[PDB]
Amino acid sequence: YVSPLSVALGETARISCGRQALGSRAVQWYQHKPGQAPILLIYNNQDRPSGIPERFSGTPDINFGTTATLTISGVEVGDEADYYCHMWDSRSGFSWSFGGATRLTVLSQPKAAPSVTLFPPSSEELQANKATLVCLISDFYPGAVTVAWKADSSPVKAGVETTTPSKQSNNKYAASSYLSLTPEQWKSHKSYSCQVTHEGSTVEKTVAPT
Amino acid sequence: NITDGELKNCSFNMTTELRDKRQKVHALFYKLDIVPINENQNTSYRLIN
């Protein structure tokens, strides 16, 4: 259902509706950010409610053979979301489908360096016969990040749980790495290290039992 | 796809440029120029004339 759309930082972007109207139409447009509520961009082909900046526009229905198109001009990193096209024409009837989504991706964003923070297993966790190392990566772009764990000088392969990259409220991606161990394996090695790799750069923090 | 028409869609088998060859074509007709063939009733029709 996802329609990939590659655009740059604030260029001219044309979002064409997947369905073409068979007659007089009344197109609705919705902006949906992952994890948020849908936002009504354009209703009745071209009208927009208050609160919508003068960036989103629709194509009017003047009987011309013009396809419905969502006209977003000058996208920011805050417009990177999915877009649905709700088509209503006199010939299709009651349309229950919002159709496929056009997932907008904004490129040309300045490269950001990941801020890594590593935490050792808590003391209340050791007494519960558990041990987990939490490695928090955030404030980086693009989302391509490779996280690796190493015990002393040997790379750990099992027990690593890593999340998928996802942007946050600052329009930058954030990830998390969880290395679950045992109280006897945590105190076995002298030191552990969370090593991440972003855009070829390699940064790393280190914890040790104390 | 309208719920609750003056024209019907009528598909039929028609003769071609060749005699042995027959084609199936679709054409729109008005309800006033077409009456049902069975009134029993199905959805089979014929021309009024």
């Binding site: 259902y1 007659g23 007089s24 139409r25 009344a26 609705q28 919705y30 949906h32 948020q36 509520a37 849908p38 936002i39 009504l40 209703y43 009745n44 409610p49 649905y84 709700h86 209503w88 024409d89 006199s90 229950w96 489908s97 919002f98 159709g99 496929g100 989504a101 923070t117 935490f119 808590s122 209340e124 966790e125 519960a128 558990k130 987990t132 939490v134 928090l136 955030s138 749980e161 890593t162 999340t163 996802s166 946050q168 954030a174 998390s176 969880y178 | -």
Partner: protein, 226 residues
């Protein structure tokens, strides 16, 4: 107007589903109310809508499994999806529907059609369909150099999502970052929420992480200290 949903969170398949939507900012017997959902890996699926005459109209793709009703005694909107399976795991939104009349000719000839557009939405509620029971997380304080230090709480092993993490109610607002959860191989979720705290404030100011795992439901208070 304002809308907010409340849901049990997780129920076993092949029984009965019931969610509620509390309206705010207008009359409930005054508008057309609809429900929208969105499953992981799927788009927005329209469920149905109810009129001001308390007449309903459901999406035929749900196979008549949905029922919407109004309750003016409490100004609440209700949706029941009845017997569902794992494919109905979605985020259910309640919204306001305005009916527009698109005219393209003579009114007497019915040369017009109605269309519904949703202008006001709610934040949605997370619903998961599994055969296991809920599990409460046992969180642990992550004890805390550039002038600031890292201060977080390790919300470990819970099911299902989500978890709302607050710090000192309204006192700590920035920089408080709650990282997204991780789906472990055992089917348990875990997240972490760190706060950037100056070094001089440690030992003088107190900090607590309010963990809200409403679908479980759980609450673990932890006073993080170095």
């Amino acid at each position: 107007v304002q809308l907010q949903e409340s849901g049990p969170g997780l129920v076993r398949p092949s029984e009965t589903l019931s969610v509620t939507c509390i309206v705010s900012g207008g009359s409930i017997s005054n508008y057309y109310w609809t429900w929208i959902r969105q499953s992981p890996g799927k788009g927005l699926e329209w469920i149905g809508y109810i009129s001001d005459r308390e007449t309903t109209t459901y999406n035929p793709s749900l196979n008549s499994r949905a029922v919407i009703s109004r309750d003016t005694s409490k100004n609440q909107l209700s949706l029941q999806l009845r017997s569902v399976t794992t494919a109905d795991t979605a985020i259910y939104f309640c919204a306001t529907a305005r009916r527009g009349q698109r005219i393209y000719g003579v009114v007497s000839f019915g040369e017009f059609f109605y269309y519904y557009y949703m202008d006001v939405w709610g934040k949605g509620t997370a619903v998961t369909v599994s055969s296991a029971s809920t599990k409460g997380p046992s969180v642990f304080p992550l004890a805390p150099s550039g002038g600031t230090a890292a201060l977080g709480c390790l919300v470990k092993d819970y099911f299902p999502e989500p978890v709302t993490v607050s710090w000192n109610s309204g006192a700590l607002t920035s920089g408080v970052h709650t990282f997204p959860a991780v789906l472990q191989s055992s089917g348990l979720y875990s997240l972490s929420s760190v706060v950037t705290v100056p070094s001089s404030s440690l030992g003088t100011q107190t900090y607590i992480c309010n963990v809200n795992h409403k679908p479980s439901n759980t609450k673990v208070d932890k006073k993080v200290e170095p």
